Amino acid sequence: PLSDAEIQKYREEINRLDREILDAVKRRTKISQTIGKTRMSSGGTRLVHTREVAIINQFREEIGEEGPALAGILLRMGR
Amino acid sequence: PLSDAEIQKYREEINRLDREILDAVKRRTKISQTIGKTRMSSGGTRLVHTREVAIINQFREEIGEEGPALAGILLRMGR
């Protein structure tokens, strides 16, 4: 089993990964807010929905059951 | 306002940021699952809770209202 020193090093790495996740989420949200479309038609809203489903599906495929919820956060933030 | 070409380039960048977010979430979850403690006492569970609150607080401070929910996903995944 892992020593306290090995657990130490892994907790340090999780700290740095949370920094990287937060950095990338901030960058994604800034870009999204800059580009998110103006007045939409129903046809245009349909194109957006299809893209959001792909993103939700991708997150589900990659990380499993929490994927949809994580994608949902990012989509809400990006408006 | 942004041209279709500028929006293009930004959508490409969001694709690549979702890849980086997913990569880091997978790495964080693998490390977390490898290190997450065995039998805990109540005192030990108290130390964990205090660490989880710091993480929740950090995510709230950095990204705002969705921070707690995002932290909650990562904590659930990491068990």
GROMACS .gro file of C-alpha atoms in nm:
model
  158
    1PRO     CA    1   0.000   0.000   0.000
    2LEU     CA    2   0.098   0.361  -0.052
    3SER     CA    3   0.323   0.531   0.195
    4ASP     CA    4   0.233   0.872   0.341
    5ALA     CA    5   0.508   1.014   0.120
    6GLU     CA    6   0.352   0.862  -0.197
    7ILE     CA    7   0.008   0.995  -0.092
    8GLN     CA    8   0.172   1.336  -0.035
    9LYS     CA    9   0.305   1.349  -0.384
   10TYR     CA   10  -0.031   1.244  -0.532
   11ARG     CA   11  -0.219   1.513  -0.332
   12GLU     CA   12   0.028   1.768  -0.470
   13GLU     CA   13  -0.045   1.647  -0.822
   14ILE     CA   14  -0.424   1.674  -0.763
   15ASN     CA   15  -0.368   2.035  -0.648
   16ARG     CA   16  -0.189   2.110  -0.974
   17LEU     CA   17  -0.458   1.930  -1.182
   18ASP     CA   18  -0.732   2.137  -1.018
   19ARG     CA   19  -0.538   2.446  -1.119
   20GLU     CA   20  -0.517   2.321  -1.476
   21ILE     CA   21  -0.888   2.230  -1.485
   22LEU     CA   22  -0.983   2.571  -1.348
   23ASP     CA   23  -0.750   2.748  -1.596
   24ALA     CA   24  -0.902   2.561  -1.894
   25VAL     CA   25  -1.259   2.614  -1.772
   26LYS     CA   26  -1.194   2.987  -1.738
   27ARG     CA   27  -1.040   3.004  -2.090
   28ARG     CA   28  -1.329   2.799  -2.244
   29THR     CA   29  -1.589   3.017  -2.077
   30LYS     CA   30  -1.425   3.344  -2.188
   31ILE     CA   31  -1.413   3.221  -2.552
   32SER     CA   32  -1.767   3.089  -2.538
   33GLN     CA   33  -1.907   3.411  -2.402
   34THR     CA   34  -1.724   3.608  -2.667
   35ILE     CA   35  -1.875   3.396  -2.956
   36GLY     CA   36  -2.224   3.291  -2.837
   37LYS     CA   37  -2.476   3.395  -3.097
   38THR     CA   38  -2.699   3.693  -3.099
   39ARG     CA   39  -3.063   3.677  -3.207
   40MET     CA   40  -3.138   3.314  -3.311
   41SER     CA   41  -3.409   3.168  -3.532
   42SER     CA   42  -3.563   2.834  -3.453
   43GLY     CA   43  -3.354   2.682  -3.723
   44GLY     CA   44  -3.040   2.831  -3.572
   45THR     CA   45  -3.138   2.712  -3.223
   46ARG     CA   46  -3.172   2.361  -3.368
   47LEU     CA   47  -2.807   2.367  -3.491
   48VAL     CA   48  -2.691   2.475  -3.144
   49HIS     CA   49  -2.889   2.198  -2.978
   50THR     CA   50  -2.731   1.937  -3.201
   51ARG     CA   51  -2.385   2.068  -3.110
   52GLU     CA   52  -2.471   2.064  -2.734
   53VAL     CA   53  -2.585   1.703  -2.759
   54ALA     CA   54  -2.255   1.604  -2.919
   55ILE     CA   55  -2.066   1.770  -2.632
   56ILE     CA   56  -2.284   1.597  -2.369
   57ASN     CA   57  -2.233   1.265  -2.548
   58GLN     CA   58  -1.860   1.315  -2.571
   59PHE     CA   59  -1.832   1.388  -2.198
   60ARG     CA   60  -2.047   1.081  -2.119
   61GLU     CA   61  -1.832   0.860  -2.343
   62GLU     CA   62  -1.505   0.987  -2.193
   63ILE     CA   63  -1.578   1.002  -1.819
   64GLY     CA   64  -1.908   0.811  -1.778
   65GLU     CA   65  -2.201   0.895  -1.558
   66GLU     CA   66  -2.091   1.244  -1.451
   67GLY     CA   67  -2.013   1.348  -1.808
   68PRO     CA   68  -2.351   1.501  -1.883
   69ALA     CA   69  -2.352   1.704  -1.566
   70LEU     CA   70  -2.001   1.833  -1.625
   71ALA     CA   71  -2.088   1.928  -1.987
   72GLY     CA   72  -2.401   2.103  -1.847
   73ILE     CA   73  -2.192   2.321  -1.624
   74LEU     CA   74  -1.962   2.425  -1.906
   75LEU     CA   75  -2.261   2.499  -2.137
   76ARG     CA   76  -2.432   2.713  -1.871
   77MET     CA   77  -2.113   2.902  -1.803
   78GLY     CA   78  -2.050   2.962  -2.174
   79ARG     CA   79  -2.374   3.159  -2.228
   80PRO     CA   80  -1.861   4.176  -3.457
   81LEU     CA   81  -1.688   3.846  -3.514
   82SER     CA   82  -1.668   3.703  -3.861
   83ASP     CA   83  -1.767   3.340  -3.931
   84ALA     CA   84  -1.395   3.270  -3.971
   85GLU     CA   85  -1.315   3.414  -3.623
   86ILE     CA   86  -1.604   3.211  -3.473
   87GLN     CA   87  -1.464   2.903  -3.652
   88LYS     CA   88  -1.128   2.942  -3.493
   89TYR     CA   89  -1.282   2.993  -3.147
   90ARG     CA   90  -1.500   2.679  -3.183
   91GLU     CA   91  -1.184   2.487  -3.272
   92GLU     CA   92  -1.017   2.618  -2.959
   93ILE     CA   93  -1.317   2.516  -2.743
   94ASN     CA   94  -1.289   2.164  -2.892
   95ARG     CA   95  -0.925   2.149  -2.785
   96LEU     CA   96  -1.004   2.291  -2.436
   97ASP     CA   97  -1.270   2.024  -2.382
   98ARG     CA   98  -1.007   1.765  -2.466
   99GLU     CA   99  -0.770   1.919  -2.213
  100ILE     CA  100  -1.041   1.938  -1.945
  101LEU     CA  101  -1.138   1.576  -2.004
  102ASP     CA  102  -0.770   1.466  -1.999
  103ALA     CA  103  -0.708   1.643  -1.666
  104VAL     CA  104  -1.032   1.514  -1.512
  105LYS     CA  105  -0.939   1.158  -1.609
  106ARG     CA  106  -0.586   1.198  -1.463
  107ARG     CA  107  -0.721   1.356  -1.137
  108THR     CA  108  -0.977   1.080  -1.096
  109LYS     CA  109  -0.724   0.800  -1.153
  110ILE     CA  110  -0.489   0.951  -0.889
  111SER     CA  111  -0.771   1.012  -0.646
  112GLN     CA  112  -0.903   0.660  -0.673
  113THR     CA  113  -0.555   0.522  -0.621
  114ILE     CA  114  -0.502   0.723  -0.294
  115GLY     CA  115  -0.849   0.750  -0.131
  116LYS     CA  116  -0.827   0.621   0.222
  117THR     CA  117  -0.925   0.287   0.353
  118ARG     CA  118  -1.110   0.242   0.684
  119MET     CA  119  -1.160   0.591   0.838
  120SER     CA  120  -1.225   0.700   1.195
  121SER     CA  121  -1.451   0.991   1.269
  122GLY     CA  122  -1.147   1.200   1.332
  123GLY     CA  123  -1.003   1.102   0.996
  124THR     CA  124  -1.334   1.174   0.820
  125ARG     CA  125  -1.324   1.522   0.975
  126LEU     CA  126  -0.982   1.595   0.812
  127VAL     CA  127  -1.120   1.485   0.474
  128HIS     CA  128  -1.425   1.706   0.511
  129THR     CA  129  -1.210   2.008   0.584
  130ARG     CA  130  -1.005   1.938   0.271
  131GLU     CA  131  -1.325   1.897   0.058
  132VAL     CA  132  -1.456   2.231   0.182
  133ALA     CA  133  -1.133   2.403   0.078
  134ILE     CA  134  -1.166   2.253  -0.271
  135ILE     CA  135  -1.533   2.362  -0.298
  136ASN     CA  136  -1.436   2.710  -0.179
  137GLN     CA  137  -1.149   2.733  -0.422
  138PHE     CA  138  -1.373   2.639  -0.716
  139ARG     CA  139  -1.636   2.893  -0.602
  140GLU     CA  140  -1.372   3.167  -0.571
  141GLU     CA  141  -1.222   3.093  -0.914
  142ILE     CA  142  -1.528   3.035  -1.136
  143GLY     CA  143  -1.824   3.157  -0.923
  144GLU     CA  144  -2.164   3.003  -0.888
  145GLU     CA  145  -2.095   2.674  -1.067
  146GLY     CA  146  -1.775   2.614  -0.871
  147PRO     CA  147  -1.932   2.405  -0.596
  148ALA     CA  148  -2.112   2.183  -0.840
  149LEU     CA  149  -1.801   2.128  -1.048
  150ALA     CA  150  -1.595   2.046  -0.735
  151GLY     CA  151  -1.878   1.804  -0.633
  152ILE     CA  152  -1.843   1.613  -0.955
  153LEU     CA  153  -1.469   1.577  -0.917
  154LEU     CA  154  -1.505   1.466  -0.551
  155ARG     CA  155  -1.768   1.203  -0.642
  156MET     CA  156  -1.555   1.073  -0.925
  157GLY     CA  157  -1.245   1.055  -0.705
  158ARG     CA  158  -1.397   0.804  -0.458
   0.00000   0.00000   0.00000
